[model samples]
Target: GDLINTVRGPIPVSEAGFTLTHEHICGSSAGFLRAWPEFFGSRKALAEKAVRGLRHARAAGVQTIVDVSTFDIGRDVRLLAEVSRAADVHIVAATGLWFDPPLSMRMRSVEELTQFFLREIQHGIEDTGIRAGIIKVATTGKATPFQELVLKAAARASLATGVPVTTHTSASQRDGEQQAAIFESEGLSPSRVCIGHSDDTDDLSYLTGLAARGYLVGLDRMPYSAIGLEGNASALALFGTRSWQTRALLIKALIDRGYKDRILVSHDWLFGFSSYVTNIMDVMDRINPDGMAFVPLRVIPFLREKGVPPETLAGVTVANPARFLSPT
Candidate 1:
């Protein structure tokens, strides 16, 4: 099930070097924006804009990026290949269904869905030669049926292909628990998966449960305001090494709970439509409607400041991603 290669053979990745865990290289928003906008319509424009934005991210020192835009939400595999070449940044594209209500019910049912995922993982997106770097699954508050189905298939696919799985948890912070349940049921190791966007939860106990369960919880929302200091502070409150301290405190808390390898850090930054309409200068406002999810580009500095040892920091930023993405 390898995708037909327009360029080189299947992209082989190495995680031992510098890597970014989760991020979007270009655009998103399939149903809402792609449907019928009062503003405009043009697929060519969208693709072109994405190519440009990716060039910008490359200049910012981003060596690798994970493109989680699935289905028709601008996941253009051809573009994934094109941008990787253009930006010179390793791009890991994904394959799976998303949680938008319409396709939710039909997307579930592991018996039916697992093959679709395997086909994409094995064939590299319809034999195009672009295999997904990781399997993507998503769920809402209580592991809704669709989310459950996706996770089940993700587990199966992981077992089949050895590619790592990353999940998008909606409103419920408990989404991690449900995802873990599927992993446990499939008897897959928690280290093979990552529970994304864990910083949105306010409850310490829920976070504890996930980390304890051996899930690599993503604290990538450091730029967002709800999780940290308030009152319109834009960039990371603590840049460089200081950021590492803040992140490590959370990691240490999990370690105190007897979990260390279960933490992953990243800047889940996406440069989609907003970056196109305005510019990076205006990206903050668009991301932070209530000014909640805004963070400037100080993540690298913050990690250094927070006392995350170079080796461990390198692991989270680099090695861990390799372990998760590798088919072992």
Candidate 2:
């Protein structure tokens, strides 16, 4: 009776078991790819490695993954399709834009941007015959004028297509509140939206506030336990060091307060990164050991040991996502 689009095509919501609500198979700008083709590795190699990681996740019982990578963020739909098929896993591709917009996209009218997203959802992304299953939009600290335009377009496109909208937020700044304000103003139901990166901050009030307003809050960055980058080092230094135990506590708190249905989980992990200055594999090698399997392997077991009820685990990992992605 319910279905959601995957890279392989639409599937029954019941089939979307143990899903990760936010993740990226590959994240590189188009410019970056052109500038450093050798750095990201060949297309075939990237797909093969991605398939390996995805297969491991499937073996760990993760059936579906919503790849929230956007256009500006080097979304390779064809490659994602290859990995999904090779790994025997379901992957939902996303449409819409990320925080960094090209000058041309920034200048486009809201109607133009909305039409672009609608076309991808209805038809296919650049003629790959692969449709985007969801919409992903983001904001930094506060909503810039350009950022608001993106959010408005995402909301309108989501309303037009019936695909769910998932967002990236600066949790420390409580930017989800601002995003919700704009989406709600656009006549979007809070239920149709997921406010992402809420786990970056442990403020119970901020999280509970979003849930109280009827939005799904994303505790998606599950194993983000270190701060080693350049720009993100200082601000994220303390909070970035937060372990999975901290995340479990937050999850337990939310579940205890009866907001389990409004919560979603994911690793927000990337399979590959392409940049001019750094080695993608070298950086990620140190960060994620089991890749996407961290949730099913480590975190879930940790939650269970912490005395989280079985049905509650199922609710956050399975039932809730299916309901959120299914037609409402």
Candidate 3:
């Protein structure tokens, strides 16, 4: 309930207005950027592009964004700081293990993993002195043995720091419930956690169960429909291809259930990605024209049209995230 950590340093929680709790500044698929350097452009150019995108969101009333580009997925803390400065938006960077653990991390003990996450949260990432504000843990589908260990590590770090945990769950597999169980068993309170990507599934019971446990639900991937563009994108379609109205109605249903304060909204939009194939940003831009502003520009209007109270949308985009970032 004090300050919220950002790439630009900690700010009082009150400054975290209209926060997008799950978005990325830049990210890659494993070591693809390192492996295929020729596929990308200058880092500065990329940073400027990212700054422009953040500025657009800022213009659309976004004051804060959680860059959940965890290290394994190729987070750039320095760039995040630069873009936050240039775009004039608050950015809360994240640290945690991803869906697929590298052999280096897999070899590390759970305590070792916890210390690694703790160092990022307590100190700074790579000596830039930009601390991580959120801890992200992912599952391939359900809880793999290694994912369980990383989840435990996240729990331990959160317990030690009081920072919040945001999870990458497979809603098709309905894994949020199991992830919640593991975190709770490790003494991590559900209120200190958000079960991410909850809109990917229609199982109201599954989502209701997590909300009933007092966990914030991430209805975050409103504009990832670009995932369906790939030949192999079928695999990720669960998180990306769901229609906008479907996502809005999910929030509407939860609101009707008296869980309005329990939901967080965002477009899992990224500035760009490291690629091996031809650049797909062009195609993605074609479909998701508004980028990060899709929710506020498009979805919010539709929600209002569908009888969702504007105050409810405001709370999800504003007040709810303030509470989530400013954990008590």
- Highest TM-score, which number? 2
lDDT of 3 by residue, 1-328 (tens): 4898898887999888889999988767555555654455767777788888888888988899999888787787877888999999999999898765678888888899999999999989988988999999998577878888899999999999989999888888988978988998899989999999888888999999989989999998887654445564533443355667788788889999999999999877876765223556666667777888888888888889989887888988889998888856
Ranking by lDDT: 2, 3, 1
lDDT (0 to 1) per candidate: 0.60, 0.85, 0.84
- Any idea how many clashes model 2 has? 0
Q: List candidate 2 stretches off by more than 4 Å.
A: 31-35, 227-239, 275-277
Give the higher-TM-score candidate: 2 or 3.
Answer: 2
Per-residue alpha-carbon lDDT of candidate 1 for residues 1-328, written as tens digits (9 for 90 to 100): 2221122244445522455666664444445444543222355554555456556555654566677666645456775676677656677777776565345436457876888788777776755777776777777678766667778877888888777788777524467877788888988888788888675554558887777767778765555442333343443331221333354356545544555466665565554443133343243434343211122235545545665455665655666666666674
User: Which candidate would rank higher by lDDT, 1 or 3?
Assistant: 3
Best by lDDT: 2
TM-score for candidate 3? 0.93
Per-model TM-score versus the true fold = 0.75, 0.94, 0.93
Model 1, residue 256: distance off in Å is 7.7
Clash statistics: count for each candidate? 30, 0, 0
Where model 1 places Cα greater than 4 Å from the true spot, the runs are: 1-12, 26-49, 72-74, 101-108, 226-260, 273-297
User: What is the model-wide C-alpha lDDT for candidate 1?
Assistant: 0.60
